[PDB]
Amino acid sequence: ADTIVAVELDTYPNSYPHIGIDIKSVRSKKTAKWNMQNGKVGTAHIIYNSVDKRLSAVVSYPNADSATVSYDVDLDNVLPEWVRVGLSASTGLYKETNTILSWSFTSKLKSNSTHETNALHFMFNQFSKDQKDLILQGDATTGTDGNLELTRVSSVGRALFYAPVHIWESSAVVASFEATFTFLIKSPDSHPADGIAFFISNIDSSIPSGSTGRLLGLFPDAN
Template sequence: MSVVSMIFIFFLFLLNNVNSLSIKFRRFHPQLDGISFQGDAYSSNGVLQLTKNQLDAPIGGSVGRASYDEAVHFWDAKTGEVTDFITEFSFVVKALNNSSLFGDGFSFFFAPIDSKIPKNSSGGFLGLFSPEYAFEPSKNEIVAVEFDTYSNAWDPIFPHIGVNLNSIRSLGYVQLESDFKKGSVGHALISYNSDSKFFTVSVTYDNIPNFTSEISYIIDLRKFLPEWVRIGFSGATESLSFEFSTFQPNSNSIIFQGDAFTSNGVLQLTKNQLDSPIDHSVGRASYKERIHLWSSKTGKLADFTTKFSFTVKSVNSSVLLGDGFAFFIAPFESYIPHNSTGGLLGLFSPETALDISKNNIVAVEFDTYSNAWDPVLPHVGVDVNSINSIGYVEVAARHINKGFTAKASISYYSTIKLLEVLVTVPDQKPPYSVTYKLAYVIDLRFLPEWVRIGFSGATGQLVETNNISSWSFRSSL
């Protein structure tokens, strides 16, 4: 979770306009005239705070805007003349509690003068777009430069500076320098030349001399914005997030069942000792807190994304593996069923594994052995109340039996009820990685309002080791 602060200077020039305008703020005081606040934004200690910034209170799901309180004449409807402008500001993005997980970022925006924070626009929507219309340019009227600190499903895979035109998906972007995570002071300059229609963003940092991040994009801003606009900043954080870059034996954030344990900084889901039998092993590792999946009061479902890296390894150089592991969502009181080793993956009992009326679980399985109910090849599958996957993608054997570390991303988009799975594995051939994709439309409200999330793994007569080396999770509720 991060807090976004705008500090030091906000400096705006508008040139070649009927009414030229110059604005300058060196510090931001609580009673300062000229700034309008929405949501959680406020001023403190001479800076603008766009989101909540209190260590003794929840700061998740925070969203705020701070904007100039007068309309800015951006272009002339009579003459078609568009203003040139330049704006400069300094900023700090800072994590709380020394967390390495940031989210979500802030933006400088141009919007209609009556623009307000959309509903449910926290997290990756940055207080700019509603989830319903975030990807529909025809439904929006906003231009923004985003400083995005977390990679959502629609984002590049790295923190970035992006130019957004009526959509949360950036049309152009450049990587955000990693030193921003250290609370470095950044200095942004955004300019527009109406003749060339060049929209340019450049960012420098105090602690990185002779370094500039820059992006340029050709835009006719008259096509996207009204004659009179509001200018300002918008920022947001996500409601729930956690991240484990490593797993410590004494961590109290993970609940273990069965044979699961931690060793050498990773989660081991099944037995992993060459000097003792490791067949017919089963284990679970789950987050200790319950997760709010949907609201019984409003019916609103959470949007969520979980990412993890994992390794499946054979034992004694065997080419035969068994049986796999899964990421699961289940009732909070869920435990490992009896006799659920092997192909049941610690998720289902043999008696009810194929009876959807007797189960209450959703899982994404990474299945390395073909049982009677499985496809003929190893696969990634979506399981809904049954061990029989309702959707799957087959995986080449060479991608799972070599002990490679793979990366998985599982996202749920509540507005379209879409569960999306992406799995990227190294490959020995160019481009040296392969991504498997799987999507399934499902309304998750058949699950309890509050759920447990975690991993489950099992071996049968065939064995393997299933290790999770990192894990992050973010949700909008």
């Protein structure tokens, strides 16, 4: 199967809406109560570093309380050395959107050497119709208002960055990454079933057959 590490925001009544950390499985390793705010723009902050070896997420809304979750995990023992990073989304049977307004990533590998740092950094504040640097999978598309629509507008969409990412290296004193993305989940229904995730996977990851709904387009089965 693909190898997945993902921080997901989900309202699927499996059972309150929550933010969760997933290490190779949809049955989250850790979750926190999340107050999904329909129609309001949210902001997810994800961070990791090899020294602490702890993956942390923070989701907040303006004038708001924030939800936060952290999980101690050494990504070196989970993920391959080279990965692709991306955004996922799955809609239950409700009318709703999963608009990503902006996305940014930064990765750094600092060696044992003097002045040896390797780094990648992309910042999307405005997606275009032909966003060549992104691999779009599922129902995802770009250009709609200069945004990225992950889900159809039971839909599943995804968008991974083109260039593979060097997440870890056996000779680095401190590897690290940090991702930030602003989303807008709008639904006419009062209690919609929806989910987005920032995930890290093998370079050639693709939508598993039947990864719909609570499987977020990341996993082929919970069982």
